[PDB]
Design a protein around this ligand. Structure first.
Ligand SMILES: Nc1ncnc2c1ncn2[C@@H]1O[C@H](COP(=O)(O)OP(=O)(O)NP(=O)(O)O)[C@@H](O)[C@H]1O
Ligand SMILES: [Mg+2]
Ligand SMILES: [Zn+2]
Ligand SMILES: [Zn+2]
Lengths: 156, 665, 656
DNA sequence: GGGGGGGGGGGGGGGGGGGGGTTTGGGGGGGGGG
DNA sequence: CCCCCCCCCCACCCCCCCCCCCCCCCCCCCCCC
């Protein structure tokens, strides 16, 4: 992300993002006083194509035909929109925790109102809970051409 | 008023369109009056930004991208023109626009400093202006493998061809400006994130120190790209033949280039002293030791499972802690109770020069590509084998004069140059018998010692701690070299009396003061002190008399405060500290001065399972020291139970009891 | 050398972009002033091949309509000053502000004081060459101009929205200068610029101005979305002149800006800093029936051919061999009668309803699929794919307002059009019963969830059905051939009975025609594109007396402009026909001749006169209408009586 | 040459102000009657 | 066996928190013994 300060038109840039939409804490200009008042420069900031997909336990692998277990999966970049509903897929990527971003505190949103963890400064009195999700870098399924040249040029 | 700034930016934008552009009939093509436009842009820099101290033109010129989008195209196409013409031999005019492009590059890459004398506008604009210089450095190094670098050397070659006298003041200046170009291109570096301190900090600190512009990565700016582009443009060949040819108007910039090449690179990285995977496996085993350590310090069950330990003290009172591991290990319980305290002692704090070995974090390293490693080490090798003594004589024979007027930056960079290449040649000559200590003989020539002494003495008297630290490093390498040549052998005895009396005292006073200054300052004090003691021992005016000047409590404080960083220190540094302790405690036997609790704490922490490496040679030295130290502490306490109180405190400078405390009759 | 308030650049300098982003270049003031001059020169000097200035004529028309919108064709801007086309593509938000100022300048030049009629002009970027489907949009399209296909799925109300708004600080000297409102977020005032501090803020009631606003949910066309996927959608936002240019359940093609914004809700529920997105529409196009003055003159010219009716009827579904009574009924329905209301007291259906009842493989469904392509407003529904509410109208509780609102069914969407109902025999009767009101009273009278109202549903219904058991059985009368009851059957005021009789000389001509049609439709079968269109035109002329492209505009023209009158019709001819048809319809199994069938004769005679573009109904139109209805009745009979009925009614038909 | 006192910086505490915290309709599945 | 029914599912005060201000402590520098 890239931001410009409200009271001086300096620009902060390459702000790494946590799970919350994250804004700068200090202004880079020593002549400026600011903390936490910003406008996002859309054209300078960098975005990734993003797509959450939810998976459930494979039909033959459920131990006795019971309710399957579920998991949230994140696709990004060129891997988005390759999967489809009802498709049976193999994924690879990272198993990750995802905090309750509302409980962590988020601009324009209230904290959400078994246990979490507290004491961390951003929470104050609150206590934070985590989901588990899979951050996928590659996906494939494990379960037409109308001209001769465009088909034949794909063959060995 | 900002109306002036937008008018200025409109003017510079119009000038940006006057320089030229691509011709679709793609090649870059100059504009009409292009030479006059380049001169007018140079005139804008002078007229406004220099004469009024603004940097507004230096910002506007970056906004309209003139350097990357016009000047380097002009220079690279002119380079191709002259290259092809050289093989196949109105250049009289196009030479002029190439020269004025070089002048503009030297201006726009000119190093930035901020001080109390800078205008408010300049220090406000400093950050983004630095960022634009980084984009310039990236473009200069990258574009057509940095062909503009060969353009610069060709512009210099076209005045090196003529006679030594035939190089007029304009030709001398042109060569100097080419050197300033190469210096600047080396010298651009990311700026410091500089924050206003009127308003308090939020509940979180600065989110990140990263000050790069979005189109730059740090690898674009790294030395590796410099080495690659300089090699592929033979800039190293240009500098090597230039320093060989010296037979002095340009000598100071020529020194300065080598400083800027050396200021932040460590000599050992050029020497080895499945290989990558093998060493990675070694690294991973080393940090797996810390994994098993924290695992020992971790509960076998979930965080909500915690029962309560109670530590009943030796008195009839009780404390409480929740640590499940601590419940079966009172050491953890005690230290965890201490960790729990909200209170801390508040600690008090603690520019016109670049980052270097003077101020970097002590483990920092440039991770070369092996091709760039070979190219750089062979370049500095051939420099040492040709250019070192001649260059050092030329510039030191300058610096004999004008010491009163030598700017602080110039002093520190000269001292770092001296130290870096002397240290390198000593190391290479330890590795190669083919390399000769005499190839840096200029370092030991007595004018050099006298000047370095004048620099350190004046810096310390002036309390210029920056230059004092630089001279301290240079002294360390001078003494290091002296020891090597004393073994390899006259001049040794000359310096070993010239450094007498007040110089011995001065060197004895740096490690008294070092405890008040940064880790690198203290490290250089320790290094200097170890070198000084081995030099004096190698000679051995009196040996007992000199070392008594070091064995005093503020020096012990400096050694302790250096040693407090033990995890971040290197094994050899800990070895030097404990060799000094070996001298003080075992050899000189002034053991009372080290019976103080700070050392006891630090010894336990480093001998801890989460302390040093179990396999470290320095751990073996610490263990040996600790065994003897504890035995003597037990013996002294048995002889003198008053020391159970005295252990807490500085020793009694009241001599009438102080002698009894020190020796116990 | 030059005034900084008037410094300006060359066109090659504009090609030589030397700010970092495009927007940073557009906002450089010398570049901006140059761009203004460039677009002004473009509008005033780009021409038709006739030499007539394009935007001179479009501006002249804009003022005549008192419009706020100017349709700039992008391909014109790509032909001349193509760099501006590039900037317009890569950086539309800045460019369109400049181009709006330029367009207002151009029309103010053309019309003095057009600032009194509208204080602003918006350029509409027509004919943008690259197109995306909703699945196809990505981060790399963010802030780009885009051209998108979809169907408008949910259209909200025409609300006011802030455009230019001065604000009041409730501390200090209150007023703040006018902020410009976007389509994406509320205005934020971090601090009051007078007192340079925080405070409360409020809208200034004197100096604030409003524009129209309307969100639309745009969704993937069902004839585009691939299998195995959920259809994708985006919230389009319409502003100012673009509100209510479309209605739900219709395809649109949308030129706009794909813009993102922060939303704490999306971040909250997804747990990542993921932004919402819209398409801020710059222009909307529905997706043939529009016609020119020369086309109007062409319609007049061809209509006065005394053979035009049969040339139209032959042109109906041209690749369907024979079935001339179906094509007649389809022609009559598709032109329709004239709706009427006597003194406001007694409204009368103008639409003509047609039922195609017959055997399998007799092109009934394909005839409906032909009409679906041919009519201006139409929709197609099949059997168990329909529901009663899905057919007439329905209600839903709006998730925005939480109030109940109607949503139109098929017979609302096809209002003033025709509705196509395939497999009418195999709908549920609890769906079929919904047809009755709309089919005759031309209305739908909902009373549900507090809503109580009557909607207009002016549709001609054309229906296709198989007889009982599987195929027709002419030993029986109609009431035993089909499960449908007399009320619904009486509303279908022409019946076509279609039978698949084996007949050698008919089958050979049919089979030859079908085979010829198949090869004439095979894929492989003045530049290259135009040349194959000319061959295509001759292929169409192989079977069609008039082009389908001409016929559709001719239908739409005849429907919308022509209103026949029954001036001096033969009353007693019709009355005797109705009297005899009623008497012979006393047979309890036959097609129930009713007063609405007498009206059918009159509607049909008007429809034939409509095909002639005729202000007056002739005897020939009325005779043909009688002959159509008499044939429809006579063939709805068990064969034991059909010959006698044919002989009796021949006195009325065989005069023509 | 060391210790006290004066002066300036930096950190912590305490107070004050502010914002947040069920009916109706429709489709499809599933079961029962003619 | 087929169709209809009916059942399901779904759309003003008090606490936490943050900002601002004032005092106190700790270090450094200079003078006195
Ligand atoms: N006269 C014809 N001319 C051309 N094609 C015909 C003709 N009659 C039937 N067909 C073909 O028959 C096929 C099926 O037509 P279709 O419209 O389904 O007839 P249908 O009467 O509606 N049958 P059904 O759906 O069982 O009631 C199409 O592919 C037509 O091309
Ligand atoms: Mg059909
Ligand atoms: Zn700021
Ligand atoms: Zn205010």
């Amino acid at each position: 992300a890239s931001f410009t300060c409200d009271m001086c038109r300096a620009i902060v840039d390459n702000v790494e993002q946590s799970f919350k939409y994250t804004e700068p804490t200090f202004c880079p200009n020593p002549s400026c006083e600011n903390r936490a008042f910003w406008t996002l420069n859309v054209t300078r900031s960098r975005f990734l194509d993003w797509q959450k997909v939810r998976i459930q336990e494979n039909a033959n692998e459920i131990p006795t035909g019971s309710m399957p277990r579920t998991l949230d999966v994140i696709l990004r970049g060129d891997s988005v929109e390759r999967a489809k509903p009802g498709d049976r897929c193999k994924f690879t990527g990272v198993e990750i925790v995802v905090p309750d971003v509302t409980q962590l505190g988020l601009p324009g949103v209230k904290p959400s109102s078994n246990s979490g963890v507290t004491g961390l400064r951003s929470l104050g009195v609150r206590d934070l809970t985590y989901k588990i999700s899979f951050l996928a870098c590659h996906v494939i399924s494990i379960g037409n051409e109308r001209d001769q040249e465009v088909f034949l040029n794909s063959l060995s | 008023a900002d109306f002036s700034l937008t008018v200025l930016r409109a003017r510079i934008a119009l000038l940006a369109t006057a320089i030229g552009g691509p011709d679709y009939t793609p090649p870059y093509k100059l504009g009409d009056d292009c030479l006059a436009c380049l001169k007018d842009l140079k005139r804008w820099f002078k007229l406004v930004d220099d004469q009024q101290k603004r940097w507004d033109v230096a910002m506007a010129v970056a906004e309209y991208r003139i350097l990357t989008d016009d000047l380097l195209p002009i220079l690279i196409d002119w380079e191709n023109k002259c290259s092809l013409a050289a093989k196949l031999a109105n250049k009289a005019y196009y030479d002029k626009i190439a020269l004025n492009c070089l002048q503009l590059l030297v201006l726009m890459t000119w190093p930035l400093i901020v001080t109390e004398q800078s205008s408010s506008n300049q220090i406000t604009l400093y950050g983004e202006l630095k960022k634009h210089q980084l984009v310039y450095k990236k473009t200069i190094l990258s574009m057509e493998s940095g062909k503009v670098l060969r353009a610069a050397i060709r512009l210099a070659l076209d005045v090196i061809k003529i006679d030594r006298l035939s190089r007029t003041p304009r030709d001398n200046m042109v060569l100097k400006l080419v050197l300033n170009f190469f210096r600047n291109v080396i010298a651009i570096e990311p700026g410091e994130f500089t924050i206003n301190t009127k308003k308090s900090m939020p509940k979180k600190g600065i989110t990140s120190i990263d000050t790069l512009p979005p189109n730059v990565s740090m690898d674009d700016i790294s030395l590796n790209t410099v080495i690659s582009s300089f090699h592929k443009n033979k800039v190293f060949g240009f500098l090597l033949t230039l320093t060989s040819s010296l037979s002095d108007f340009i000598n100071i910039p020529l020194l300065e280039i080598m400083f800027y090449f050396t200021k932040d690179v460590n000599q050992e990285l050029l020497f080895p002293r499945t290989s990558a995977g093998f060493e990675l496996s070694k690294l991973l085993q080393k940090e797996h030791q810390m994994r098993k350590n924290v695992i020992k310090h971790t509960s076998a069950r979930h965080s909500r499972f915690g029962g309560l330990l109670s530590i009943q003290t030796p008195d009839k009172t009780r404390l409480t802690v929740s640590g499940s591991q601590a419940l079966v290990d009172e050491k953890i319980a005690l230290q965890k109770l201490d960790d729990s305290k909200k209170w801390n002692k508040r600690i008090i704090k603690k520019e016109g020069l670049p980052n270097s070995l003077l101020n970097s974090q002590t483990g920092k390293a440039i991770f070369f590509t092996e091709s760039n490693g070979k190219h750089f080490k062979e370049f500095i090798n051939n420099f040492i084998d040709s250019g070192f003594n001649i260059l050092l004589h030329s510039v030191t024979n300058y610096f004999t004069t004008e010491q009163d007027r030598m700017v602080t930056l110039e002093q520190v960079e000269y001292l770092l140059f001296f130290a870096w290449f002397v240290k390198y040649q000593l190391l290479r000559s330890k590795i190669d018998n083919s390399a000769d200590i005499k190839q840096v003989s200029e370092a030991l020539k007595e004018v050099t010692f006298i000047l370095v002494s004048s620099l350190l003495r004046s810096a310390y008297d002036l309390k210029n701690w920056t230059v004092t630290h630089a001279g301290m490093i240079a002294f360390n390498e001078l003494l290091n070299l002296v020891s090597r040549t004393k073994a390899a052998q006259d001049i040794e005895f000359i310096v070993s009396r010239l450094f007498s009396d007040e110089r011995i005292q001065l060197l004895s006073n740096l490690p008294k003061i070092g405890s008040k200054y940064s880790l690198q300052f203290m490290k250089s004090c320790i290094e200097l002190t170890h070198s000084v003691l081995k030099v004096l021992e190698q000679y051995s005016v009196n040996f007992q008399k000199v070392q008594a000047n070091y064995m005093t409590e503020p020096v012990i404080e400096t050694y302790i405060n250096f040693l407090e960083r033990f995890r971040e220190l290197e094994d050899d540094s800990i070895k030097k500290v404990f060799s000094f302790f070996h001298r003080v405690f075992v050899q000189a036997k002034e053991q009372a001065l080290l019976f103080r609790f700070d050392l006891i704490i630090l010894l336990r922490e480093m001998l801890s399972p989460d302390g040093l490496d179990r396999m470290s040679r320095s751990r073996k030295y610490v263990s040996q020291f600790s065994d003897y130290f504890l035995a003597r502490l037990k013996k002294r306490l048995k002889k003198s139970p008053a020391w159970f109180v005295g252990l807490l405190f500085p020793p009694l400078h009241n001599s009438e009891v102080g002698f009894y405390q020190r020796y116990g009759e | 050398d030059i005034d900084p308030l008037r410094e300006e650049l060359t066109l090659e300098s504009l090609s030589n972009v030397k700010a970092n982003s495009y927007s940073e270049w557009i906002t450089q003031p010398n570049v901006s002033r140059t761009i203004a001059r460039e677009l002004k020169s473009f509008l005033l000097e780009y021409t038709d091949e006739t030499g007539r200035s394009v935007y001179g004529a479009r501006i002249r028309t804009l003022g005549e309509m008192n419009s706020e919108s100017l349709e700039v064709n992008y391909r014109h801007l790509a032909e001349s000053k193509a760099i501006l086309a590039l900037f317009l593509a890569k950086c539309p938000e800045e460019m369109l502000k400049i181009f709006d100022l330029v367009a207002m300048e151009a029309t103010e030049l053309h019309y003095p004081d057009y600032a009194r009629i509208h204080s602003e002009i918006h350029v509409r970027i027509s004919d943008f060459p690259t197109i995306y489907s909703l699945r196809e949009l990505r981060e790399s399209n963010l802030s780009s101009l885009v051209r998108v296909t979809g169907v408008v799925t949910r259209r909200t109300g025409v609300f006011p929205q802030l455009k230019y708004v001065k604000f009041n600080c409730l501390k200090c000297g209150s007023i703040l200068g006018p902020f410009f409102q976007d389509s994406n977020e509320e205005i934020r005032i971090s601090f009051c610029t007078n007192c340079k501090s925080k405070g409360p803020f409020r809208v200034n009631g004197e100096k604030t101005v409003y524009r129209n606003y309307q969100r639309v949910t745009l969704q993937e066309a069902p004839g585009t979305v691939p299998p195995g996927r959920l259809p994708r959608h985006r919230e389009v936002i319409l502003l100012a002149d673009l509100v209510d240019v479309s209605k739900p359940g219709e395809e649109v093609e949308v030129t706009g800006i794909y813009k993102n914004n922060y939303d704490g809700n999306l971040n909250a529920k997804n747990g990542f800093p993921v932004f919402a997105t819209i398409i801020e529409a710059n222009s909307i196009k529905r997706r043939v029936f529009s016609w020119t003055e020369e086309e109007e003159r062409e319609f007049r010219k061809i209509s006065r051919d005394r053979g035009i009716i049969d040339k139209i009827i032959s042109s109906m579904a041209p690749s369907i061999y024979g079935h001339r009574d179906i094509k007649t009924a389809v022609a009559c329905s598709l032109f329709g009668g004239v709706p009427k209301n006597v003194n406001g007291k007694h409204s009368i259906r103008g639409d003509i309803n047609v039922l195609l009842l017959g055997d399998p493989g007799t092109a009934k469904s394909q005839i409906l699929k032909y009409v679906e392509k041919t009519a201006h407003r139409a929709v197609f529904a099949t059997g168990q794919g329909a529901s009663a509410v899905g057919l007439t109208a329905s209600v839903r509780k709006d998730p925005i307002t939480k109030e109940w609102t109607l949503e139109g069914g098929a017979l609302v969407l096809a209002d003033k059009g025709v509705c196509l109902i395939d497999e009418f025999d195999k709908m549920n009767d609890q769906d079929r019963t919904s047809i009755h009101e709309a089919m005759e009273q031309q209305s739908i009278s909902i009373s549900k969830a507090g809503i109580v109202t009557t909607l207009q549903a002016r549709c001609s219904i054309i229906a296709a059905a198989n007889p009982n058991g599987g195929r027709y059985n002419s030993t029986l009368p109609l009431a035993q051939n089909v499960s449908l009851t007399e009320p619904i059957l009486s509303r279908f005021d022409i019946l076509c009975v279609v039978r698949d009789l084996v007949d050698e000389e008919a089958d050979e001509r049919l089979a030859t025609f079908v085979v010829d049609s198949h090869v004439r439709s095979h894929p492989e079968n003045l530049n290259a594109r135009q040349r194959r269109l000319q061959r295509q035109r001759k292929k169409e002329e192989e079977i069609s007396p008039i082009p389908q492209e001409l016929l559709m505009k001719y239908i739409h023209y005849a429907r919308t402009k022509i209103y026949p009158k029954l001036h001096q019709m033969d009353m007693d001819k019709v009355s005797r026909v109705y009297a005899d048809l009623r008497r012979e319809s006393i047979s309890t199994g036959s097609f129930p001749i009713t007063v609405r069938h007498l009206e059918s004769i009159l509607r049909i005679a008007e429809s034939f006169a409509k095909m002639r573009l005729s202000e007056f109904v002739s005897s020939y139109d009325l005779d043909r209408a009688i002959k159509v209805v008499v044939d429809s009745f006579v063939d709805a009979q068990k064969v034991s009586v059909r010959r006698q009925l044919r002989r009796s009614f021949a006195i009325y038909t065989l005069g023509h």
